[PDB]
A paper describes a structure:
Mitochondria possess their own genome that encodes core components of the oxidative phosphorylation (OXPHOS) machinery, translated by the organelle’s specialized ribosomes, mitoribosomes, in proximity to the inner [name] membrane in order to efficiently generate ATP. Evolutionarily descended from an α-proteobacterial ancestor, mitoribosomes share several features with their bacterial counterparts, and it has been long recognized that bacterial protein synthesis inhibitors can interfere with [name] translation and aerobic metabolism, although the molecular bases of such effects have only been described in a handful of cases. To explore the molecular basis of the off-target effects of tigecycline, we isolated 55S [name] ribosomes (mitoribosomes) from Jurkat T cells, incubated them with tigecycline, and analyzed the resulting complexes using single-particle cryo-EM (see “Methods”).
Our analyses unambiguously identified three densities corresponding to tigecycline molecules; one on the mtSSU (‘mtSSU site’) and two on the mtLSU (mtLSU site-1 and site-2). Tigecycline density on the mtSSU was detected in two mitoribosomal classes, ‘P-site tRNA’ and ‘empty monosome’, but not in the class containing A-site tRNA. In the mtSSU, tigecycline interacts with helix 34 of the 12S rRNA through its polar edge and through ring A, which establish potential hydrogen bonds with the sugar-phosphate backbone of several nucleotides (A1258, U1259, U1325, A1326, G1327, and G1328) or make indirect contact via coordinated Mg2+ ions (G1328). Ring D stacks on top of nucleobase U1259, which further stacks on A1326, stabilizing the binding of tigecycline to the mtSSU A-site. In all our mitoribosome classes, we observed additional density in the region of mtLSU helices 69 and 71 (denoted as mtLSU site-1). To form a tigecycline binding site that consists primarily of a hydrophobic cavity between the base of U2628 and the nucleoside of A2604, helix 71 must undergo large conformational changes. However, comparisons with the translating ribosome suggest that binding to mtLSU site-1 could interfere with mitoribosome recycling and the translocation of tRNA from the A site to the P site. The third density corresponding to a tigecycline molecule was identified at the catalytic peptidyl transferase center (PTC). In this position, the ring A of tigecycline faces the lumen of the nascent polypeptide exit tunnel while the 9-t-butylglycylamido extension is in proximity of the terminal adenosine A76 of the P-site tRNA, potentially hindering the progression of the elongating nascent chain along the tunnel. Further studies are needed to confirm these findings. Together, the efficient binding of tigecycline in all three sites is likely to assure an efficient inhibition of several stages of translation.
Residue numbers in the entry:
A (entry chain X): 87 to 245
B (entry chain D): 61 to 298
The structure:
RNA sequence: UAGGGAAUAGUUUAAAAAACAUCUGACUCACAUUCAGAAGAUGGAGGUUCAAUUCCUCCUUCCCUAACCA
RNA sequence: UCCUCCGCAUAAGCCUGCGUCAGAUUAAAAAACUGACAAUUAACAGCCCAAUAUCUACAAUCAACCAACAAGUCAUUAUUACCCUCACUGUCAACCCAACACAGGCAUGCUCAUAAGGAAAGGUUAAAAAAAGUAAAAGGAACUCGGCAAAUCUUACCCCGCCUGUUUACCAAAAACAUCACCUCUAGCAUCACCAGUAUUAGAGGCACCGCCUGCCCAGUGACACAUGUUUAACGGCCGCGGUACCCUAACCGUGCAAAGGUAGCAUAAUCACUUGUUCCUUAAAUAGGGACCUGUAUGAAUGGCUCCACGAGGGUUCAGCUGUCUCUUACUUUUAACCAGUGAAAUUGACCUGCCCGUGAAGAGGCGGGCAUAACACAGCAAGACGAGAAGACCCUAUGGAGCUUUAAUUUAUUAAUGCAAACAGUACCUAACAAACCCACAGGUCCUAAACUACCAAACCUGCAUUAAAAAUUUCGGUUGGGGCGAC
RNA sequence: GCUAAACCUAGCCCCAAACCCACUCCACCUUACUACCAGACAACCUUAGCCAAACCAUUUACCCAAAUAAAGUAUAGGCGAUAGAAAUUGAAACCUGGCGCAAUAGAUAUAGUACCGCAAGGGAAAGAUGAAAAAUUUAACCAAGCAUAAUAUAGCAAGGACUAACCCCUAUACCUUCUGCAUAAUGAAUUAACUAGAAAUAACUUUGCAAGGAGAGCCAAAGCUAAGACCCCCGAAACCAGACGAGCUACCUAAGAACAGCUAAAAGAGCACACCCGUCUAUGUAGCAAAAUAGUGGGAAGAUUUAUAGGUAGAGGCGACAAACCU
């Protein structure tokens, strides 16, 4: 979203101008996820995926601010979780092939704890955090029956 | 704002359905077409424009009896209630269609053309060249969109290469596949264009609002323009 | 009242020609047409310019437009 | 005694807003004021339905007979599911929208005439002027811009518009707009307008029923075709200069110019140089009106021309009558008025102890000069002055002040459409010079001054980026001088 | 002597410091504040313009993360108006204070209430004894306006006077605006309160230090540091952005309602009520009324009139074009 001077002359009228990218619908296969995706892309994305030697490399290498898509960051979290877990759901019947994929991408492996939070928006993260912390309250009946026993137990040992 | 099209019913009936006026507004509530508004209330009678529509468990040519020919507020032509088997439907009446007639709905094309009786529906390939036809479709099974107004007809001009050339009421030629169905004869109410509105108020009865009083100076578009007939429109794919 | 334009053979148009009118002849019984000859004007006055049909300035003359707001 | 619009209900609105008691004191004068306490009770009304499929051509009008078009408000069945029974809310009033206890606005039913609902006069006097009425001698439009208003209850016509209709709420109702009719333009088609339509259609416009017509012009400008072009019921336009029958005029003559040279009609007026033309009607008298003629600075054909029925709160002319319009006013009634009592506004106002005449003066003095007049103060009238009041003149000019509108004003194409190109993506390629010199098989046949290189449309109606042309718009300005400005001139 | 007058609190202002705010039982996104049914609707997207440039058309400062300094320098710009860095440099922690207001001030605030507006929105006014009111009996005197107490030839209202108020003589209000105003040019009933000159450059004056000055930076060929001293108020028609508006009115949608009698009978026919409209006259003109009343009118089965709910929204709508109507 910008402006332009008509006929590239500052003394002419200043006009609003929007340059939009040329978008193509193409399909892409993920080795780690063993899935085909129909993604809207630019010609640039296709040039970047080539320079990365594939979609898995492109998603795994490119950082958040250069992917510029929540979908790319979900693909990353997805790929990263299979690598962190060595997930056997990838080609369940081909352990040899499955290990060739995971070795190919061994550079990007991170702990599963960290991979779960990769790409989450702040609002997603809080919901993830709120759900992890969602626990039913403990009835005070159980809490006091523990204090009583421990209170009776300590009294017995002393004498 | 909250405009909802009346054309919401999904099953064919012959019961006249209530329709809602638009006033020439679109769904935004804004005037889209000027000069529409008011008029007598009307009910819509669903016209079946697919003449060769065999019943659910039936197939092939079939006949129908004309039960009634009556007035239609929603179009300039007349409509005929026909009954065949266990089904009734509204169709466009032809010039001389009357109660008690029997009409033929056929999809058969033979080496020899049939004798074209008014009110019968045949594929274009089955008709003699020069027959007067109405209620034409552009693709086989699409349903009649052409030659539907009162007193109208087209002419079968040629039958070449499994296609039929016809002349539209506007005199422009139109090419379709020979399996397209048409009805023989002219649409009913042949004297419809001789009607005299008579007084301004009768145009209000028909749902027309008066023209703007604003004066417009005529521009280059005005004045007689003698241009050739457009080239034949083809709906055939090679 | 105030601005603009225009005055070319008798006529009407050109840029000093043309068609008429006129004059002379031929053709005709005669006339007309036609044919062949001939003459015929740059509004007047005032300039300049190497040279004034496009240029003056004025007069004389005819036209055109404008003459509005309270 | 008088009035009667009314009134009573429902709806909507409003929300305790003339019940009681106790207070104060009741109201544009003398409780609807304050505080307490009461109060409208459901049958009327509101608040409603288990599912899925399926059904539903035949108006209404006393619905019969007839006759219509603008073609219409009222309907199920099948099979499952289904024991449970009167909750909740409105219910008052002298009421609401109009700043008000406002002559306004306000839907339906019923009565209207009333069974219901109300009081025009605070008391007096009975001047002007003013308002609203009634009556009026003789005359009867002499009034006046006009018969406005009144009275009476008429005739004939002219213009314009055909007609009913529509409009500037709050200065214009009209001749303006629409309109039946006629014609021009665009469009071959569906699932949100047009339209559940389909060229006898549907959109954009002109003009204005009907009758008689609607002439000529495509050069220019626009549209369309963009191959010579087509198109006026598109924008528009539709000739001169000389001469010839006494004059007038020119059937006629000469020459020139244009795309065509204004045709048919019509013309002393919604139209008007002279002009109040001229003539015939009309009056005693006509710058009026009618009929004609003259003929058009600048009449004229769907920017419609010319007639004509009917119609009009349109503009104009008129017979008869009618009358206070007038000659020429008068009389009476009510209102207002004036006086008494109650209540009690507004604009306005430098201060005022606020005369006249002449003169003067920022050019029209109560106020200055010179004269003249002159105890003081209420009330009623009047409208000559106070350049009276009201609204920082709507005229006119000025302001490098606005704004609306229109364009061939300048700037621009963001947007929109079309087009090209590039991007994306089909998806496969050998297709235009034979000429027999003793050498040539009984045939599908060798050579000489000719036996060659040899991508097809870039690969769709999309989307992006670039240009290009349009349409629609947007932003901004509209110099000065000037014996006011404009115009002219500078 | 009335009406009045007077008051000192309520609170408020600017800083500092410190990082605030929940259910309170029941109700509340449907017509909010409404115990209790089959759904799926979902957020993001450059401000513009006034104004300055004495028009206007490119352009015209707007905290963006340390005071100072570099520097109004580099640079940008119808190279105009104006705009304008960076490198580099690197001062300071002690909340409870005030040469702030004191009822027309200070918050709009006693309250976002009353009141006004359909809505968005706009938006007030005011109190005052005393230790005790379970002491109601103790003070003056003060604006305009009045009252006590109208008035006596003559004149900007006074002045000079005078024994004497007046009589005599002299004397053309004021402000603004103008060549020039008693002007019959502007404004002003009057009282009270409120209500309008803000700062650089250079210079000057008065100190300090002085070839130096200055508490880094900046100036210096008597400079340099410091100080003093200086440039108003109210007013358009507009322009743009985002909201709110169709309970009026224009047009439309859904579904209603009304239209007596008489004539004629095909009905946008006639007469004529209810009803709708508004031709003409008079009245009224701060009205009864921010468009009415009386009479007279036009239409009144229709392109009629009208109740209800809904729709279209300002670069817009709507329009039988009147540039109509859109509270
Ligand atoms: C002053 N002249 C130019 C003139 C003026 C007017 N009218 C006006 O100027 C009106 N002006 C207003 C609009 C009122 C401001 C005019 O109205 C006229 C005329 C011209 C005459 C010429 C007449 C002439 N004859 C008959 C004396 C004549 O020969 C012709 C002719 N065409 O050749 C006429 O038509 C003539 O009769 C005529 O009509 C004239 C005007 O109408
Ligand atoms: K009228
Ligand atoms: K006349
Ligand atoms: K005459
Ligand atoms: K009329
Ligand atoms: K007077
Ligand atoms: K003068
Ligand atoms: K300006
Ligand atoms: K004066
Ligand atoms: K003056
Ligand atoms: K004045
Ligand atoms: Mg039309
Ligand atoms: Mg029109
Ligand atoms: Mg007279
Ligand atoms: Mg007279
Ligand atoms: Mg009258
Ligand atoms: Mg006309
Ligand atoms: Mg009006
Ligand atoms: Mg009206
Ligand atoms: Mg007005
Ligand atoms: Mg009127
Ligand atoms: Mg008209
Ligand atoms: Mg006609
Ligand atoms: Mg014509
Ligand atoms: Mg003629
Ligand atoms: Mg006449
Ligand atoms: Mg004239
Ligand atoms: Mg004339
Ligand atoms: Mg003309
Ligand atoms: Mg025309
Ligand atoms: Mg008629
Ligand atoms: Mg009428
Ligand atoms: Mg008349
Ligand atoms: Mg008479
Ligand atoms: Mg006067
Ligand atoms: Mg005055
Ligand atoms: Mg003024
Ligand atoms: Mg300006
Ligand atoms: Mg401006
Ligand atoms: Mg200029
Ligand atoms: Mg000037
Ligand atoms: Mg002048
Ligand atoms: Mg000029
Ligand atoms: Mg002056
Ligand atoms: Mg004065
Ligand atoms: Mg003045
Ligand atoms: Mg005054
Ligand atoms: Mg601007
Ligand atoms: Mg009538
Ligand atoms: Mg209307
Ligand atoms: Mg108009
Ligand atoms: Mg106008």
């Amino acid at each position: 979203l910008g402006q332009i001077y008509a006929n590239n002359d500052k003394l002419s009228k200043r006009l609003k101008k929007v340059w939009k990218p040329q978008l193509f619908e193409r399909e892409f296969y993920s080795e780690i996820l063993d899935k085909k995706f129909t993604v809207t892309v630019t010609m640039r994305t296709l040039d970047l995926i080539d320079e990365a030697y594939g979609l898995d490399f492109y998603i795994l290498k490119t950082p958040k601010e250069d992917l510029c898509s929540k979908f790319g960051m979900d693909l990353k979290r997805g790929m990263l979780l299979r690598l962190a877990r060595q997930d056997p759901q990838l080609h369940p019947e081909d352990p040899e092939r499955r290990a060739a994929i995971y070795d190919k991408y061994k550079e990007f492996a991170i702990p599963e704890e960290e991979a779960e939070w990769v790409g989450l928006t702040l609002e997603e993260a809080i919901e993830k955090q709120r759900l992890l912390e969602e626990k039913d309250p403990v009835p005070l009946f159980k809490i006091y029956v523990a204090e009583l026993i421990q209170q009776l137990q300590q009294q017995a040992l002393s004498e | 704002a909250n405009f909802v099209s009346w054309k919401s019913r999904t099953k064919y009936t012959i019961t006249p359905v209530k329709m809602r006026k638009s006033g020439g507004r679109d769904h935004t509530g804004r005037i889209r077409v000027h000069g529409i508004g008011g008029g007598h209330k009307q009910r819509y009678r669903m016209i079946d424009f697919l003449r060769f529509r065999p019943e659910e468990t039936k197939s092939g040519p079939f006949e129908e009896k004309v039960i009634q020919v009556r007035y239609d507020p929603c179009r300039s032509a007349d409509i005929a209630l026909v009954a065949g088997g266990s089904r009734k439907r509204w169709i466009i009446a032809t010039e001389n269609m009357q109660a008690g007639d029997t009409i033929l709905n056929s999809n058969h094309i033979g080496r020899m053309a049939v004798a074209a009786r008014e009110g019968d529906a045949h594929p274009l390939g089955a008709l003699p060249v020069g027959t007067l036809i109405n209620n034409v479709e552009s693709e086989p099974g699409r349903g009649a969109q052409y030659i539907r107004a009162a007193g109208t007809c087209g002419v079968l001009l040629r039958k070449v290469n499994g296609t039929a050339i016809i002349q539209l009421p506007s005199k422009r030629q139109m090419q379709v596949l020979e399996t397209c169905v048409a009805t023989v004869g002219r649409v009913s109410n042949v004297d419809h264009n001789k009607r005299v509105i008579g007084k301004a108020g009768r145009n209000r009865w028909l749902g027309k609002r008066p023209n703007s009083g604003r004066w417009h100076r005529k521009g280059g578009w005005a004045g007689r323009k003698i241009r050739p007939l457009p080239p034949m429109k083809s709906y055939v794919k090679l």
